[PDB]
């Protein structure tokens, strides 16, 4: 089964070029990865449309990033709001 290298990208066969797959592959996996829920303490988030992350556990929906539940930009804003508290 397992690909030596390209995983989810294996479906694309020998096309689209190596780099673009390499770069699609990161976003592709975080996109289908289950991302950690602060609410449940559970890996549980899964995306259901770009920027939408349903929680498999407690019904819920974080907004979040496209291919990832949290943007690096967002890491700043949340604490920065915490510090203003």
């Amino acid at each position: 089964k397992r690909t030596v290298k390209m995983g989810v990208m294996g479906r694309y066969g020998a096309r689209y070029g190596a780099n673009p797959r390499k770069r699609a592959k990161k976003l592709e996996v975080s996109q289908h990865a289950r991302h950690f829920c602060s609410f449940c303490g559970k890996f549980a988030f899964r995306r259901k449309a770009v920027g939408i992350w349903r929680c498999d556990g407690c019904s819920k929906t974080m907004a979040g990033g496209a291919y990832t539940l949290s943007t690096p930009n967002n890491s700043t804003v949340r604490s920065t709001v915490r510090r203003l508290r």
Partner: peptide, 17 residues
């Protein structure tokens, strides 16, 4: 509103097809 708009990083993913 406070904070980044959600769904950021769309454009980073190559479209390929």
């Amino acid at each position: 509103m406070i904070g980044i708009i959600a769904g950021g990083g769309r454009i980073e993913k190559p479209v390929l097809k």
